[PDB]
């Protein structure tokens with residue numbers, strides 16, 4: 001139910017260094 | 027190469 | 038992972054290391070899908086042509102890791118297995134069709150900054166995201182070249198059209214597989230490799246910003262060869278089996 005939301009990124013509204021490449025491909 | 031883990035686990 | 042980068046701390050908190058007790062060696066990757074269940078490739082546990090057939094007591098799962106070889110005190114958790122479940126129709130004889138296995142942990146792991154489950158896709162997440170051109174992300178501690186990293190590696194790769202996947206190999210491809218990788222002309226590289234097996238191919242939903250595991254690192258011919266692609270177990274196609282195992286046991 002909390003699946004797929006990372007404590008150190010999504011939960012803090014921080015992005016990792018390449019996740020934009022993923023989202024720019026969709 | 028691999029660092030030894032606590033033997034508690036290898037039991 | 039070939040042509041990947043060092044992961045950030047906490048970047049893949051579902052990443053699991055399958056770890057052999059003796060000799061103490063990394064077996065495979067895997068993923069945490071609840072506090073008690075780990076998803077991996079069946080060939081990590083069972084592959085008769087190579088005389089591979091591991092059982093529960095052969096194995097430890099290590100969760101929360103970043104460094105490949107260090108025992109990461111106060112950060113990782115090491116769990117024992119209660120039960121391994123291999124797909125009843127996993128095809129090790131021919132093409133690794135239905136390359137999937139569940140492992141029930143002997144006790145539930147506690148989540149933390151470094152340990153957190155990934156989602157499994159529903160039908161409409163799969164339909165929406167599993168498209169040629171869309172990129173997913175593969176992680177692992179496997180080989181850097183067809184040598185081993187100090188730290189979890191990460192690479193992002195596009196899904197490849199099904200006919201391109203078929204025309205790249207002599208192996209019979211099924212609907213329970215997809216392939217990912219850059220074409221030779223695309224001028225970007227990267228691939229899973231030996232030791233990455235069983236690890237997660239994940240995508241981030243643009244609708245709810247959650248990470249979903251779409252694939253399991255299954256097989257390839259070489260690592261990062263031009264005109265060759267990585268093949269992954271299609272997790273959604275086999276989710277009915279997953280659901281079945283989990284709420285039966």
Ligand SMILES: N[C@H](Cc1ccccc1)C(=O)N1CCC[C@H]1C(=O)NCCNc1ccncc1
Pocket residue numbers: 080084131132133208228229230231232233234254255256257258259260261266267268
């Ligand atoms: N090289 C074989 C290619 C029934 C491929 C299906 C059947 C026979 C060869 C392979 O990858 N195999 C042989 C059986 C296990 C698997 C493996 O080593 N997988 C490791 C993952 N390797 C990758 C390399 C590059 N890209 C993705 C995965």
